[PDB]
Design a protein around this ligand. Structure first.
Ligand code: SAU
Length: 218
């Protein structure tokens, strides 16, 4: 499916987005000059705390979009997890972790990937030590970390579902809904997907209030 935009305000410069100086320094150091189409439309509503549905393809700069929005909202001196990002695969979770860490390098933001597998015991030990500002992971592993009390939902105020169509195709619906039940019902939710079938749209109905809708056409 394809959504209908209800938001088409353009901010054509990162300098006009009221971002923190250290975050702006990270954006330019990453290689960005001018915001991409999705960045021009989605960063501002995301930072302002609205629920957002974004339909956008690969290669659009959509990863940096939600990473910038999360990093702008983090309270850096609160040593607790404040944002949770779900991805369908370990590779995308790791891609996101590295985007976030690069964009946040001048800020001292921390981001851990929760993916399990080869090095899972180092993953869980790092959590007992200090709670990272941002967690990104696949839904089964993240749900397990919440259920086992390694991750606290107490300070999680942002919840991002990236590649939502693929997450549902891979069988993660139950875990996504169980995660959402664990989080404060006052969490902002942002959902990004290249396609918007009925199953993805029901997540938005269930999790979001009157969301901003942004379509970046291919
Ligand atoms: C596909 N992409 C598009 C991007 C993009 C950007 C900025 C960065 C990325 C990016 C960064 C890391 C990546 C890492 C990846 C990847 C894809 C990307 C990737 O696939 C395998 O591992 O502005 C336009 O669109």
């Amino acid at each position: 499916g394809v959504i209908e935009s209800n938001w088409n305000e353009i901010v054509d410069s990162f300098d006009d987005m009221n971002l923190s100086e250290s975050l702006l320094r990270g954006i330019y150091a990453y290689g960005f000059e001018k915001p991409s189409a999705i960045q021009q439309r989605a960063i501002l509503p995301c930072i302002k705390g609205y629920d957002v549905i974004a339909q956008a393809q690969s290669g659009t700069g959509k990863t940096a979009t939600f990473a910038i929005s999360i990093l702008q909202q983090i309270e850096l001196d609160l040593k607790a997890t404040q944002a949770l990002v779900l991805a369908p695969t370990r590779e995308l979770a790791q891609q996101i972790q590295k985007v976030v860490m690069a964009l946040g390098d001048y800020m001292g933001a921390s981001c851990h990937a929760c993916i399990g597998g080869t090095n899972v015991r180092a993953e869980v030990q790092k959590l007992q030590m200090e709670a990272p500002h941002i967690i990104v992971g696949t839904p089964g592993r993240v749900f397990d970390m919440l259920n086992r009390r390694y991750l606290s939902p107490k300070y999680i105020k942002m919840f991002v579902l990236d590649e939502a169509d693929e997450m549902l195709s891979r069988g993660f619906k139950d875990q996504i809904y169980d995660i959402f039940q664990k989080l404060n019902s006052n969490t902002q939710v942002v959902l990004l997907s290249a396609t918007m079938p009925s199953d993805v749209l029901e997540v938005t109905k269930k999790f979001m209030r009157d969301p901003i809708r942004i379509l970046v056409k291919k």
